[PDB]
Enzyme design. Structure first.
Site, PDB file in Angstrom:
ATOM      1  N   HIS A 459      35.730  29.692  35.300  1.00 55.01           N
ATOM      2  CA  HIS A 459      35.049  30.734  36.034  1.00 55.01           C
ATOM      3  C   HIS A 459      34.513  31.750  35.040  1.00 55.01           C
ATOM      4  CE1 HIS A 459      34.401  33.670  39.181  1.00 55.01           C
ATOM      5  NE2 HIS A 459      35.192  34.538  38.580  1.00 55.01           N
TER       6      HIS A 459
HETATM    7  C1  LIG Z   1      36.814  41.448  29.463  1.00 53.36           C
HETATM    8  C2  LIG Z   1      37.515  40.354  30.253  1.00 53.36           C
HETATM    9  C3  LIG Z   1      36.829  39.170  30.459  1.00 53.36           C
HETATM   10  C4  LIG Z   1      37.428  38.124  31.166  1.00 53.36           C
HETATM   11  N1  LIG Z   1      36.714  36.964  31.394  1.00 53.36           N
HETATM   12  C5  LIG Z   1      37.233  35.912  32.107  1.00 53.36           C
HETATM   13  C6  LIG Z   1      36.483  34.745  32.301  1.00 53.36           C
HETATM   14  O1  LIG Z   1      35.277  34.606  31.929  1.00 53.36           O
HETATM   15  N2  LIG Z   1      37.082  33.733  33.012  1.00 53.36           N
HETATM   16  C7  LIG Z   1      38.351  33.859  33.494  1.00 53.36           C
HETATM   17  O2  LIG Z   1      38.836  32.925  34.113  1.00 53.36           O
HETATM   18  N3  LIG Z   1      39.107  34.976  33.241  1.00 53.36           N
HETATM   19  C8  LIG Z   1      38.544  35.999  32.556  1.00 53.36           C
HETATM   20  N4  LIG Z   1      39.295  37.135  32.330  1.00 53.36           N
HETATM   21  C9  LIG Z   1      40.701  37.211  32.831  1.00 53.36           C
HETATM   22  C10 LIG Z   1      40.899  37.480  34.292  1.00 53.36           C
HETATM   23  O3  LIG Z   1      40.224  38.677  34.700  1.00 53.36           O
HETATM   24  C11 LIG Z   1      42.394  37.613  34.489  1.00 53.36           C
HETATM   25  O4  LIG Z   1      43.099  36.478  33.978  1.00 53.36           O
HETATM   26  C12 LIG Z   1      42.604  37.724  35.968  1.00 53.36           C
HETATM   27  O5  LIG Z   1      41.788  38.764  36.482  1.00 53.36           O
HETATM   28  C13 LIG Z   1      44.074  38.009  36.251  1.00 53.36           C
HETATM   29  O6  LIG Z   1      44.258  37.986  37.667  1.00 53.36           O
HETATM   30  P1  LIG Z   1      45.496  38.775  38.312  1.00 53.36           P
HETATM   31  O7  LIG Z   1      45.563  38.513  39.780  1.00 53.36           O
HETATM   32  O8  LIG Z   1      46.703  38.507  37.481  1.00 53.36           O
HETATM   33  O9  LIG Z   1      45.195  40.270  38.059  1.00 53.36           O
HETATM   34  P2  LIG Z   1      43.951  41.246  38.246  1.00 53.36           P
HETATM   35  O10 LIG Z   1      42.694  40.545  38.678  1.00 53.36           O
HETATM   36  O11 LIG Z   1      43.867  41.996  36.967  1.00 53.36           O
HETATM   37  O12 LIG Z   1      44.391  42.259  39.361  1.00 53.36           O
HETATM   38  C14 LIG Z   1      45.485  43.106  39.178  1.00 53.36           C
HETATM   39  C15 LIG Z   1      45.106  44.273  40.039  1.00 53.36           C
HETATM   40  O13 LIG Z   1      46.300  45.055  40.137  1.00 53.36           O
HETATM   41  C16 LIG Z   1      45.894  46.378  40.260  1.00 53.36           C
HETATM   42  N5  LIG Z   1      47.092  47.161  39.923  1.00 53.36           N
HETATM   43  C17 LIG Z   1      47.648  47.283  38.707  1.00 53.36           C
HETATM   44  N6  LIG Z   1      48.756  48.019  38.849  1.00 53.36           N
HETATM   45  C18 LIG Z   1      48.911  48.379  40.147  1.00 53.36           C
HETATM   46  C19 LIG Z   1      49.858  49.142  40.835  1.00 53.36           C
HETATM   47  N7  LIG Z   1      51.059  49.432  40.331  1.00 53.36           N
HETATM   48  N8  LIG Z   1      49.701  49.307  42.187  1.00 53.36           N
HETATM   49  C20 LIG Z   1      48.637  48.736  42.808  1.00 53.36           C
HETATM   50  N9  LIG Z   1      47.735  47.969  42.144  1.00 53.36           N
HETATM   51  C21 LIG Z   1      47.854  47.843  40.828  1.00 53.36           C
HETATM   52  C22 LIG Z   1      44.749  46.541  39.280  1.00 53.36           C
HETATM   53  O14 LIG Z   1      44.020  47.747  39.607  1.00 53.36           O
HETATM   54  C23 LIG Z   1      44.026  45.204  39.450  1.00 53.36           C
HETATM   55  O15 LIG Z   1      42.939  45.304  40.383  1.00 53.36           O
HETATM   56  C24 LIG Z   1      38.714  38.224  31.671  1.00 53.36           C
HETATM   57  C25 LIG Z   1      39.416  39.431  31.491  1.00 53.36           C
HETATM   58  C26 LIG Z   1      38.852  40.466  30.753  1.00 53.36           C
HETATM   59  C27 LIG Z   1      39.674  41.717  30.609  1.00 53.36           C
END
Ligand SMILES: Cc1cc2nc3c(=O)[nH]c(=O)nc-3n(C[C@H](O)[C@H](O)[C@H](O)COP(=O)(O)OP(=O)(O)OC[C@H]3O[C@@H](n4cnc5c(N)ncnc54)[C@H](O)[C@@H]3O)c2cc1C
Ligand SMILES: Cc1cc2nc3c(=O)[nH]c(=O)nc-3n(C[C@H](O)[C@H](O)[C@H](O)COP(=O)(O)OP(=O)(O)OC[C@H]3O[C@@H](n4cnc5c(N)ncnc54)[C@H](O)[C@@H]3O)c2cc1C
Ligand SMILES: CC1=Nc2ccc(Cl)cc2[C@H](c2ccc(C)cc2)N1CCCN(C)C
Ligand SMILES: CC1=Nc2ccc(Cl)cc2[C@H](c2ccc(C)cc2)N1CCCN(C)C
Ligand SMILES: [Br-]
Ligand SMILES: [Br-]
Ligand SMILES: [Cl-]
Ligand SMILES: [Cl-]
Lengths: 487, 491
Positions: A459
């Protein structure tokens, strides 16, 4: 001299077979073609149709035409530049394409000159007798013999040729051959045909046309790209229209007259008329058998004019084989290369091998492009009781920004709903030809829809769409399209 | 008197890739009542991530849009080989328009997700900071400060930790003068000179972004404390990417690591490296890693164990040591990818609320690096494979594609490598560098899950002309590993 193998046609299938027999099996090989490099008079040359007036130059030309979209779509991402200063320089495109292809031609001549047991002969090959291939100065069988080559085995690999319907004024029309060499990009162009060559060229002409130009594509039936996914056929029609190509369906040229200014006056069966600068006929390609004097040895031809062959490419005449477009089956370069390789493995290897002509992945380099592999649903629905179709059609986000909102990516998977087996995969949108390739591998592995769906997406890509569909959009049950399963 | 807390089957903390997939599925497939907590309803400062997660707000989505913008630098230049003519001196890369367009695109996504809460019965969004008061109580506070006002106290039968990761900022003098990717997305002007610190995808990708939009006389430098950027990736690729970045004007400083950063009097930053070397830049972007965002969850209230590297420890089914408390996505410090957080979230909900227990397969996950040109990869790199299999074969194809002889970007070598277990032909890993690599690799992920062998790749008929067809024309290894050791021919 005498050779283990005489190949008539230094093309995609011919050079595969030639090269492999010489270098893998130490055989003495002769390969005949009519021209050592691309372009008029004979267009195809050493390298084949693909190298000279086929896949290679057209892909460079479509790549060329894509910058029309690129330049426009850059603005959405903050690119700024004098839009009024933009010109599509066709002479430059053709000269660059010419040079690129000439280098391939030269690089094929090198390989002949460097490889032992692989000799190339210039001129027109025909069948004089069973083990005798004559090389003449011209396609006229009454022209001077240049060589008479004895051959244990004879391979026919003369490809195909544009089909030019015998309507009055047909001689005022060009084919794909001449299109590669037009000195000027046409202001008005009619491409006749709804198949991929007409579609691809319509995209190329559309991007390089002078100010006030118009590209018109016509097609005798209702919908272009017969044999392709129907949602994709409709959608590519919309996207070509959206980028300024007129698609005239249910129209067919009945007559072409030459105006004194060199333009063409086209009269359709409908009595409609259109004036264009160039009429490019792209209604089919036919097996190139006329010049081979097959009558000399009684090599059978099918109704369509194709050399008949069995699954191992043997004609009715023993030690006489045919591969590639001459056989009038799947007209693709990699199919011809595979047949060629398999033939050499059966004639000079110990293990027979036959080309599989099913589940072959292919592409249309339209703008936007198509990738497909395996069965379209209507063909699927005819051979399987229960067919499910998973479809996704979204204008990708980059295209909301680019301003090209009409550029929907379409991803369809067709399955035997009884066991989940993927029967074909159909895509439209940038990267479709790249995406589909490993899909072709999946189908060789009896991939099921749960295999696609349970694979983790990459993605963000369009491709991940294929790994994201788990509920059919609709089915065919007993040939019948329906949104839900009955029971 | 007292009155009832809002109660849920599932409380998800983190409305991101993982959390939303889990939330949506529990609500819409298993008819569960689901609370989802995040700290902002839309992208940007102060908290950057928001409804939709890192991916939507300050990750995959805006970066892909930005890489796409960055690719026009190359298109506008390369167009000339194909006869496009225009006034190259009128060309200007307008960063502010890029960011404004990108912001609108992300905002529509944020709004769209809010509409989706609004419209979906049993799926409720809560703005604020989520923490674990106790095993079945999630409290939502005004700020990350565990003393800020409790906005809501949620009764929860199951708690999903899905808070993602956050950039790691090394404890150096002047770290406060540096930014992360979070801020890179909102820079009001494109930096003239930028250092991207880090050898991993985010530094590599933003280096290319900065490079395309930097004003006249700008310079992008990427530094990395080790020898070769993109550790984890195929080595031929890592070296090719390095060359292709350099060819595109990016300065790569390997074996370099910042020791301190000071503010120059003009507001630019003066970076001193461990080695004594120095660099002035306008922006120092730290991209050295991302760490699990565990700090604000007050996990000590319920005793949820961390790994020694700091993720929430989970088993194969995403369970913590605390019953009814789960963790998926980057908070577990496994593969930090969106589709993996998503796969974990759906697998978790299937297991807990569906009747289909399932665990995520973390092997053979395809992924991409949006450098220019990009990398597409799935499965094992050869050096890893060689450690696990007695006979590894490597099939490799490399070359400047034709279009790039004509475009003029002759540095643009396409690399295709297939890594096999030579004992049965099984494809272990496939590694691509070149235009469309990310698109090519996706169905290659399906091939690996079907245990494809090199013979299936080779047997498949190529689509011509593509870069992908290279994968189906390789029959003879370029070399092997035979118990750990490289060689071009078997013994
Ligand atoms: C610059 C960058 C580029 C990336 N590019 C890609 C890519 O091209 N392809 C890919 O597959 N992955 C990519 N990633 C990685 C991907 O974004 C992460 O692996 C993924 O978003 C993680 O999903 P998640 O559900 O763990 O957390 P997240 O999507 O990070 O969601 C966690 C959420 O928790 C919220 N949160 C945090 N603490 C609290 C709290 N205590 N209370 C309430 N809410 C809170 C945050 O605000 C956030 O919205 C990229 C990441 C970065 C930083
Ligand atoms: C415009 C166009 C675009 C195409 N695009 C694609 C594509 O994108 N992808 C794809 O897979 N396929 C494409 N094709 C089809 C592909 O070109 C053919 O499928 C392929 O070239 C067939 O190879 P062949 O070995 O059968 O014959 P060819 O490659 O055509 O070789 C035939 C050779 O025989 C020579 N010859 C003919 N008669 C004689 C004679 N009597 N004596 C000696 N030599 C002779 C010709 O000069 C020619 O060089 C395209 C075709 C065209 C026309
Ligand atoms: C194996 C092979 N198959 C072909 C199939 C179709 C075409 Cl059009 C060309 C090839 C080339 C090839 C190159 C030179 C000669 C004299 C024959 C075949 N070819 C040789 C490959 C060159 N190699 C050194 C990377
Ligand atoms: C199944 C799913 N998984 C996601 C994984 C990660 C993210 Cl960032 C988003 C989704 C979306 C989604 C969007 C809004 C809500 C409230 C929940 C899920 N989503 C629902 C998609 C809605 N669908 C009908 C078009
Ligand atoms: Br580093
Ligand atoms: Br290293
Ligand atoms: Cl011109
Ligand atoms: Cl027609």
């Amino acid at each position: 001299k005498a050779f283990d193998l005489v190949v008539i046609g230094a093309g995609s299938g011919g050079l595969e077979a030639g090269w492999n027999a010489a270098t893998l099996y130490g055989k003495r090989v002769a390969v005949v073609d009519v021209q050592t490099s691309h372009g008029p008079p004979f267009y195809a040359a050493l390298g084949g149709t693909c190298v000279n007036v086929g896949c290679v130059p057209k892909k460079l030309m479509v790549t060329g035409a894509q910058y029309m979209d690129h330049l426009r779509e850059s603005a959405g991402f903050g690119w700024e530049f004098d839009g009024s200063s933009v010109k599509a320089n066709w002479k430059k495109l053709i000269a660059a394409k010419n040079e690129a292809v000439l280098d391939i031609n030269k690089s094929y001549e090198g390989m002949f000159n460097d490889t032992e047991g692989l000799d190339f002969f210039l001129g027109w090959g025909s069948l004089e007798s069973k083990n005798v291939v004559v090389v003449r100065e011209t396609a006229d069988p009454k022209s001077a013999v240049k060589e008479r080559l004895q051959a244990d085995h004879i391979l026919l690999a003369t490809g195909s040729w544009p089909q030019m319907p015998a309507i009055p004024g047909i001689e005022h029309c060009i084919s794909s051959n001449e299109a590669f060499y037009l000195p000027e990009p046409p202001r008005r162009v009619l491409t006749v045909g709804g198949g991929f060559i007409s579609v691809e060229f319509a995209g190329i002409f559309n991007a390089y046309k002078p100010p006030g130009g118009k590209v018109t594509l016509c097609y005798r039936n209702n919908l272009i790209l017969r044999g392709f996914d129907e949602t994709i056929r409709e959608e590519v029609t919309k996207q070509l229209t959206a980028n300024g190509i007129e698609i005239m369906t249910n129209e067919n040229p009945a007559k072409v007259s030459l105006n004194t200014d060199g333009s063409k006056h086209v009269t359709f069966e409908s009595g409609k008329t259109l004036d264009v600068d160039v009429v490019m006929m792209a209604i089919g390609r036919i097996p190139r058998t006329n010049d081979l004097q097959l009558g000399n040895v009684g090599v059978k031809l099918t109704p369509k004019g194709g050399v008949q062959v069995d699954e191992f490419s043997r004609t009715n005449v023993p030690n006489i084989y045919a591969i590639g477009d001459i056989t009038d089956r799947l007209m693709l370069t990699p199919v011809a290369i595979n047949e060629g390789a398999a033939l050499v493995d059966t004639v000079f290897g110990n293990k027979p091998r036959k080309t599989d002509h099913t589940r072959v992945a292919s592409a249309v380099f339209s703008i936007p492009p198509i990738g497909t592999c395996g069965l379209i649903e209507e063909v699927a629905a005819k051979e399987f009781e229960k067919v499910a179709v998973y479809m996704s059609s979204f204008t990708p986000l980059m295209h909301n920004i680019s301003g090209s909102k009409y550029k929907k990516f379409v991803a369809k998977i067709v399955t035997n709903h009884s066991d989940g087996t993927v029967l074909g995969v159909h895509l439209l949108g940038d990267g479709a030809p790249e995406i589909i390739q490993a899909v072709g591998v999946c189908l060789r592995l009896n991939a099921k829809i749960s295999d696609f769906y349970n694979t983790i997406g990459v993605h963000p890509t369009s491709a991940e769409e294929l790994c994201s569909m788990r509920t059919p959009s609709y089915y065919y049950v007993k040939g019948e399209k329906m949104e839900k399963l009955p029971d």
